Symmetry: D2
Subunit: 457 residues, 4 copies
Amino acid sequence: TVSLPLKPREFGFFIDGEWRAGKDFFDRSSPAHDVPVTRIPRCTREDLDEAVAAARRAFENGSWAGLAAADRAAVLLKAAGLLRERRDDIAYWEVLENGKPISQAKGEIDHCIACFEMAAGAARMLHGDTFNNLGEGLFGMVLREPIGVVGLITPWNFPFMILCERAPFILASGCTLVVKPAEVTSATTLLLAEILADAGLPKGVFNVVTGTGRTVGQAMTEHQDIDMLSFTGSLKKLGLELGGKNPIVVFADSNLEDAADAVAFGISFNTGQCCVSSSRLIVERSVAEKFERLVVAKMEKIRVGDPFDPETQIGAITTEAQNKTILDYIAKGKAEGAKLLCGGGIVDFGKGQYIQPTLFTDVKPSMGIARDEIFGPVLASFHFDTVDEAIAIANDTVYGLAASVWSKDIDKALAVTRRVRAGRFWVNTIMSGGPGREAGLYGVEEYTQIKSVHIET
Amino acid sequence: TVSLPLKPREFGFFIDGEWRAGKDFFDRSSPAHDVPVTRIPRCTREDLDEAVAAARRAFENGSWAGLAAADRAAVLLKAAGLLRERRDDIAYWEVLENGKPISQAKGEIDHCIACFEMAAGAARMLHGDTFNNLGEGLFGMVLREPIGVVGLITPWNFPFMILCERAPFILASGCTLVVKPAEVTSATTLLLAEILADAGLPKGVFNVVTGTGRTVGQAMTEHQDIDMLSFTGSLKKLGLELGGKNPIVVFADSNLEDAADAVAFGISFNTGQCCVSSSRLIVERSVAEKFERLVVAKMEKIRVGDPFDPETQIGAITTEAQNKTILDYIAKGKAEGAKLLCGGGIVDFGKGQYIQPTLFTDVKPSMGIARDEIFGPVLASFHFDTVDEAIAIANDTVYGLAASVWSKDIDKALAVTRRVRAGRFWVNTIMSGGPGREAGLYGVEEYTQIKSVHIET
Amino acid sequence: TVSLPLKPREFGFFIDGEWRAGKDFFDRSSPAHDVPVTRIPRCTREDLDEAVAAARRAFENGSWAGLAAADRAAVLLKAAGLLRERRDDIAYWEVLENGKPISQAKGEIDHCIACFEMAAGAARMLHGDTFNNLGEGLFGMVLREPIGVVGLITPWNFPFMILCERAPFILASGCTLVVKPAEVTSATTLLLAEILADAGLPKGVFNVVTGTGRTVGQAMTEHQDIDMLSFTGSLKKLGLELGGKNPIVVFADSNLEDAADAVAFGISFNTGQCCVSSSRLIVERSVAEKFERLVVAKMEKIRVGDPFDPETQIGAITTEAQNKTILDYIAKGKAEGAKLLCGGGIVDFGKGQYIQPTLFTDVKPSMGIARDEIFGPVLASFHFDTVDEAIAIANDTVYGLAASVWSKDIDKALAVTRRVRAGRFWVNTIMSGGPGREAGLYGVEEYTQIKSVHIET
Amino acid sequence: TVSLPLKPREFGFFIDGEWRAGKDFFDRSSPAHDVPVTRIPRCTREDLDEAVAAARRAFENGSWAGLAAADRAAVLLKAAGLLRERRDDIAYWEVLENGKPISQAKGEIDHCIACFEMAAGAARMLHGDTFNNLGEGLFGMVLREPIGVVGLITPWNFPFMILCERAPFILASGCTLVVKPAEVTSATTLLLAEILADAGLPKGVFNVVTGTGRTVGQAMTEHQDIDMLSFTGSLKKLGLELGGKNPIVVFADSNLEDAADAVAFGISFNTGQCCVSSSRLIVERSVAEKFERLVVAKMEKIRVGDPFDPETQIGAITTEAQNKTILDYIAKGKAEGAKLLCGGGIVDFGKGQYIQPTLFTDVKPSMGIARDEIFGPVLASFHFDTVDEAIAIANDTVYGLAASVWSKDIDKALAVTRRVRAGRFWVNTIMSGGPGREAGLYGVEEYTQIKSVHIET
C-alpha cells in the first residue's frame, strides 16, 4: 500500500531562507528496499561559511533575538501544527532514508511535536535574577541572553528526533542555527527547514548545510563565528553527547514480569513507547536465569520486517558499515565465551537486512563486547550480588544517556539512581519519551548565557 | 550544683532600644522548684501601640530595611556568637521558667544559633526575577521586599526555640518585629532582645511586649499598623501554626528496632536530638504487638526528674492547667477502652510534677483521646492493615507539624510521604532538628512580598 | 440595541456540583437602568457549612488534587475557551449588575481568559527542590502541595475580574474553593460556576455561596475547616488586599504628554486598557501647572453615559452608598481649600448616576481627602520638589495595589520604583493589564505549602 | 625592603597529593628585576595522564563527591583562611613571576579569598527540582551532580585570580581538577595546591601539571577521560573565554568626572579596585574632546615603576613577546592616522620594562588597531552620535568579558546594557571586583549536570 519514489528526489540545501542547488551530490538508497530515494547536496566549506554568515546576520540584526518571546513561541507553535499536518510525509521520508519502522517514526514525530510545544512555553518563562538587597545606593541583576549562532551536528540513528530535541529549544532563546545532518539521513532535516519557513521563521535563523563530516563538519568545528557547537553524533561552548549503552538494573525484589517487559520494549518498538534504546542488562544473580528466560520469550515475539508495515517493530540496518559491526560484535562475543541465548543473525528479508533481537548472557565486564558498542536490538546481560557491584557494572562506560532500576527496596532504588551516571533515570517503569519536564525547565537555558548587571544609585 | 535566684528577677519590657519598667507584674515560679524566679511586666494596650510605632518608625526610616543585606547578616551573625557565649545563661532561665531538662534547653539553643546563621546567609541570597525576553521596547522584573512590621506571638512549650525559628528570618529580609511571648515563659525572649542590642540591632527593629493574651495579644491582632501577624501559639497576612500530634507510621517491612528507637527519642529528649515531639504511633497490625513491646521497654528507661540534672530526659509540667489536661486525658482513655501499656501517672518528685512516659494502645480513631491533644510524653498507638488506612489515620488531624514513616518499600514510603499532610517529613530516620535546608531557602522569603516592575523602552 | 430582562433572573447558588434554590433573596436592580435584573439567594450559615464540607470532600478524596497537573490544566483551558464563547453573555450580566461600560467589561473578560491560560500553564510548572549534596547516606527534598480548602471573598467594583485573578490559580495547585461574591454583583460569579461545570470541573471543587457579609462572610471567617481565607474586599493563612489610591509620580524630565495620557487612561476606560484605576497624582511642582492643564483637557473628553454604548468610558455608580461618599468627598475637598480643576458633580443621565471625571489640585498630605478613599474617576494632585518628597507622598497610604513613575532619569525612576510600596509598578508606561508575568511564575505558588522531606540511606 | 631569592626556587608539580620532581625545567626570571626566580617542571604527556588518572580515581571512589557538601565547604573555608595567612607570600611570588604591582596582587588575593568563601556557601545551596504534580502514580525530580574530572588551563596575565575564580567553584560541586597554568606564571598555582593540601583536600582532587601548551595543553585537550575542559587562556563540555577589549560607553548626559575616573581606574590599579581592565572608550562626539582631556590628565598621574613599591599602579611587562606587540600596536595606530594623545612608549626603568598609559583618539572601527588586541594600559577612543552607533562599536568584537555605560538617561543605559554583548556590566559605576553575586548563585552550577528521575508509583 506504500509506493516508493519513481525517481530519487533531489533536495537542495537551505541558506538564508532559500533553497540552494547542489553541485556534487550524495546518492542515497532505501536501506529496506535497495531503491534510490534521495539525492543530497555535498556542500563545500564555502557553503557552510555562507550559512554561518546568514545566521550571524539574522542574530545580530534583531530579526529573531529582538522579538518578544511571544513572537518566537508563536512561530514554534505554528511549526508544531504544520509538523502535525505533515506527520505522514515526514515519517515516510524518515523510513525511506533510515529503515525505521513506520510506527516508530510516527511515534518519534509526536515526541517532536511535543518538543516544539515545550520550547514555545519555555521561551516565555526564561528569566534571570534581581538583587534588591544590596542597599539603597546599589541595584544588581542577572539577565539571560541567547548564546548566539549555534552549530548543530546530528547523527543517522535518530536524525529527526535528535534535531527536534535541540532545534526548537535553541531557537526559543533567540539563538540562530546551522545544522549539518548525517549524509545518509538528511531529508527530514530539510523538510523541517521547509516547515519552519512555512511557519514564518525569519530568513537565516535556521540553515541546513548537507555533506560530509570531512568537509562540512570540519568547517563547522573550525569556524570562528559559531558561538556554540553541539555534537550529538561526533566561540565559547562546545557540547558533546554520549552513548546508547543504557543499562537496566534488575533486583530480585522487583516485579520481574514488568521488568522483563521493560527490557523487551527498550530494545524493540512498541506502541506508546518512543525513544530510549537499552543495550545492557544488569540483573541480580539469584534471579538471572529466571529473568533472562522471561526476556528471551518476549524477545522472540518482536516483529521484524517491512518497515512500512505498521506492525513491524525492528527495521532495516541503516548503513553497510553498521552491518559488519554487528556480525563482528556477535563473533567476538562467541569467541570470548559469552553465551548466546537468542538471535545472533542478520535476516536477509528481500532487499533489506534486519538484526535479530539478540541477548548474550554470562558477560564479564572485562570482555571485549562489554567495552564495544553497537546500535541494534543487541543486549548483553551481566550478573551481580551486591548493590555496589550493580553500580560499578552500570558505570563501566564513559557516561550514559539513560538508565533504569527495578526494585521495591527504597535504599537500593535510591542508591542506584544517585550513583549511576546517566542523564535520564527510570525507577520501576518503562524507559520512554512517548505516550513538568526537565527539558521544559532547562532545554532553553542551555543555549543562553548570563549577564550580571551592577547599577550604582 | 545549681543555685536558684535569691529573689525573683524583675524584667523590664523592651521598646525602641530601651528597657521599660512595668506597672503591674506577673509573678512566675519555677515549675520544677516552686520558688519565685521571675517578675514579668503585664503591658497595656498603650504599651503595644508604642512598640508598633517604634517598629513602624524603624522600618520606614531606612535604618534596617535600607541597609545592604550584608549589614543585616553581620548583626545576625554577631547575635549568633553572643548567643553561643551566653548559652548557659539562656538555658538556665529557660529551665527555670519552663521546666525543660537542661540538656534539651542547651540543645535547643544550638539549633537557635544555627537558625541565626541560616538567616544571615539567606539574607544575602534573597532575590527576584528578570524578564529580558519581552522584546526590545520592554523590560520586566520582580523584586522581593520586606513585608514590613511583623507581629509574632509565641507559645509556652518551646518559647525560645520557636522565637529563633522565626525572628532571625523575619529580621533578615528587613522586616521589623514586635514579639509577645507567653506570660509564663518570657525571660528568654527578653534576653534575646538584650543579645540583639549587644549585637548592634538598631532601635525599634526588635520589640518585646509582655503580658496577657487578653490585653497585649488582642491589641496585636486588632492593630491596623502591623503588616503581618504570625501566631505559633494561638495588614496583608496572618499566619497560624498547627499541632504536635505528629504521627509516626511504622510498617512491618521496616527496621523495627530503629523505628522503636525513633519513637523513644521522639517522646523524650536524647543527646543529638533537638525538637520534634511525636504523639501518635500508626503501626501495621501484624507487628503491632512486637513493636509496642519494643517501645515500652525503651520508654521505661527514660530518665525523669531534676531538670538541672544533665541526664534528665523529661522535665517538669510547665503550668497548672497542663496538669489537669493530662490526668483528664488518661482518665478519658481508660473510660473509652484504650489499653494503658505503661505510665499513666504524674510523679510528684519533690516540689515538681513530671508526666510519666505513657503509651495507650488499641485506640480507634473515633475515640475521644484520638481527637483530644496534649503536650507531654503521652503516646497513642493505632493499628492498620493497608497503606490507605495508615494515611487516613495519619491525616485525621487538621494539619501536622511533622511526620515520619518507616518502610523499606519505596512505594509505601513515597505514598505516605506524599499523601500525609505535614510540613516536615522523615523517612527511615529519627525526627530531629539537632546534631541545604528548606528554612535556608524559604524562611526569609516568607516575610517578603513581590513587586512586579514593567519598564517601557 | 440591547434589551433588558423582561423579569429579573433568579439565580440559585452552587454547592457540590449542583444548583440550589434560595429561601430568602436579595433583589438587585441595574445601577444604570433602575430596572430589576437579578434575584440572588441570601444563604445561611448552614449553606456555607455545606459548601465547605463539599470542598473538603472534594479536596481529600483525590478527585482534584490527586489528578496530574495536566488534567487540571485541561479543565482550566476548556473553561478559558467556554469563557471566550460566552464573553458577550458574561459582559452583559456584569454591566447589568455593576454599571461598568460594556467595552471595559469585555476587556476585563479578555484579561480573565488570559488568567485561566496562565494558571493552566503554571499548574504544570509547579515544583520544589532536591538536595542531592547531603552525602551518600542522606537525601533531602522539598515538595509543593495545595494548601487545601480556600475561602475567597470578592468585592463589588471588579467582581468578575478579581475572581478570575484568583480562582484559576487557586484551582491550578489542586486547592478547592468556596467563593462569596458581593451581594450586588453575584451573577457573573455564578456564571463562572456554570462555565467550570461545563468545562468538566469535578463536583465540590468550586462552590458559590451568596448572601451578606454579616451572615455568609462571618461564617466563612470563623469556619475552622477552611485552610486559607483570601479577602479582596474586606486554618493556616489569611490574606487581605489593599487599596486603589494608586499613585502616579510625574517628574519634570519626563514625557509630559505621554504621562498625561497615562493619567487619563488610568482614570477612565480606553481601548487596549484593562484594569488599573489610579487616584493620586504626584507631580513635580515646576511643571504641575502645565501638566495639570494637559490632564484636565483629556479628562473633559472622557465619554460618560449609557454603559451599553460601546463608546462609553465611565459607567454608572454601582451602589447608593458610593453615591454619598462621592458628594461628601468633593464637599470635604472644597471645605479644606483644595482647588477643584474640573468635574465635581454627579450626572443624572436618565435613570442612572455618573461621576464626572474630577481633579482636585493643591492638596496637602494633611488634608482629609488625602486620607479618605473613593472609587470613581476622582483624582487628587500633590506637588513635590525632591525625590524623597514624592516618595513620602506616594507612601502615605497603608499599602498600594499599583504605582507608576514618569522620568527619563534612571536614578529617579529606580529610587521611586524601589522605595514606593506597591505590588505592581509601571515605569514610563500606561498602567494596564490588557492588550513572562509575575502571576505566571507566582500566582499558583501562593496557594501551596512546602513539605520538607529527609530520607536516610 | 624586599629581597629577591638568592637562588631560583625549584618547584615540583603536584599529582595525587604529593610533590613530584621534574626532569626538564623552564627557567623563569623576574620580569621586573631580570633575576632568576623560579624553576618549573616541563611535564610530559605521561605526567598529565597520571594527573587525570588520579583525578579520575578521586572522583569515582567517593572521597570528594560522596562527602556531604558541608565537608567540602569546610575544606574550602579552611583554604580561604590559609590563603589569608599566606597573602604576603602568594603576592610575593605573583609579583616575582608576573610583574604585577604588589598592591594589585594583594587586592586580587582578597578577591580570591572571597571566591573561596562564595564557593563554600554555594556548595550547600546547590539543588534541583521536584515534580509533585504528575498525579498519584508518578513522581519526578531533577538532581544536580558534579560533571566529574575538569581540565583547566589558565593564562599568564591574571594567573592566580583566574584560578581562584574557577577552582573553588569546580571543587564545590564535587568535581576533581587538573590545572595547567602558564609556564611563565606557575608558582602561585602550585602554592594553591599546597594550601589545599594543608586545608585537608583529599589526594587527587587538585592536581597541577606544569609545562608547555604544545605538550601538556595538547595532551589535555585530547584526553578522553576529562569530562569538561575549561580554557581561560587558549568528555561532554568544553568552555572557552573571551577578550579584555572591554568597552566603556560614555554619554554626554553622564557625570563626566566620575566617568573619567572610571576610565583611569579601569586602566591602572587603584586602591579598592581589583580586576577589570578596560581598553576601549566609546564616547559621545559632542563631549569627546572635553572628556578625553579629563582622562589624559588622570592617566598622567598613574604611578609607574617598582612593583614592590606599594604605590606603583602599573607593573612590568610580563613576557618578551608582549613587548613587541605593544610597540607594534602603537606603530600601527600612528600609521593608520589615529591620534596619540599621551604615552606611546615603553619605559626602561632599571632592569624592567613598563608600558606608559596610552590613549589613541580618532579611531575608526575599520582601523587595524580596532581589530587588534593588547594587554597593557593602552586605550583607544571611538566617537558616536547615536545610541545605536555606540552599541555597534561596542559589539565589534567577538564577545566581551566586561562593559560599562555612563548615562543618566534610563532608556540609553538600559539599551546599552541589554544590547551590548558582555558577561559583566556596570552602570554609572567603576568596573571592579574588589572593595548576592552572580557567581554566588551560578559558579557552582556551571560544573554540574542534571539527572532527570521518573518514578512510577
